[PDB]
Every structure is written in structure tokens, then in C-alpha cells.
Amino acid sequence: SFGLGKAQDPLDKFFSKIIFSGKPIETSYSAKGIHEKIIEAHDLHVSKSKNAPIQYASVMEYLKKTYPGPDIERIVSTLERHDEVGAKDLGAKLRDALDRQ
């Protein structure tokens, strides 16, 4: 028998571990809220700190040690395509190694 109200609606993905997936590199970086959406979905306690200390400077980069080049140029272009204010820091900084030396 056929009935209405049994199927679920499409999700915008709440996981940020898509960068290490392989094939998906558009949909995720094509949706609204790719970098600043995981803070509202849960939103608990003031400031989230686990391994990032605050003394002088805190920076972590791994997209330049195991990555060759085209992979980085792909992520930046996909982020600067829609113009996201929550991901403008991610894309621009990754594309700041070509414009700024």
C-alpha cells in the first residue's frame, strides 16, 4: 500500500570531514553554511577549545604538506564561487599563497 508522510526530507550535511572524502568536493562546498554551520547545529558553551591553545599564535595547516597543488586550487575556487562569509577565511587563506608571497 502507498502512503504519504513516511519519507524523510534532504539534509544539508552536518559533517565537516568531507575534505578527506575523495569524490565529493562540490555539493559540500556548494551548499549554504559549509564552515560556519556546525556551530549553530549544536551551539553549546562559550568558545570551543580542545587542542588549540591561546598564548601568542595558533595556526594549523595540513593542506600544503600532503597536497600537490591542483587539489588546493580546486577547494579555493569552489569557495570563492558562491561567496560565503562563513567560509571566506578558509578559501581566501588557502588562495593567499598564490596572490601573496
Curated annotation (Swiss-Prot):
The keyword Signal applies. Its main location: secreted. Disulfide bonds: none annotated. Residues 51-101 are annotated as: Highly variable C-terminus domain. It is found in: Secreted; Host cytoplasm. GO terms for cellular component: extracellular region; host cell cytoplasm. Residues 40-50 are annotated as: Single repeat region. It comes from the Eukaryota. Keywords: Host cytoplasm, Secreted, Signal, Virulence. Residues 1-39 are annotated as: Leucine heptad repeat region. Secreted effector that acts as an elicitor of hypersensitive response (HR) specifically on plants carrying defense protein RPP13. Recognition of ATR13 by RPP13 initiates defense responses that are effective against oomycete, bacterial and viral pathogens. The allele ATR13-Emco5 recognizes RPP13-Nd, the RPP13 defense protein from Arabidopsis thaliana ecotype Niederzenz. Has the canonical translocation motif RxLR, but lacks the canonical EER motif, which characterizes most oomycete effectors identified so far. The leucine heptad repeat region contains five protein variants with 12 amino acid polymorphisms. Leucine heptad repeats are a feature of coiled coils where the leucines are embedded in an alpha helical region. Three of the different variants were recognized by RPP13-Nd, suggesting that alteration of the amino acid sequence in this region is tolerated. Belongs to the RxLR effector family. The ATR13 effector protein is a highly polymorphic member of the RXLR class, yet only a small subset of the polymorphic residues appear to be involved in RPP13Nd-mediated recognition. Polymorphic residues of ATR13 appear as clusters across the surface of the protein. ATR13-Emco5 is recognized by RPP13-Nd because it has the critical residues Phe-20, as well as Thr-66 and Arg-95 within the highly variable C-terminus domain. This is Avirulence protein ATR13. The lineage of its organism: Eukaryota, Sar, Stramenopiles, Oomycota, Peronosporales.
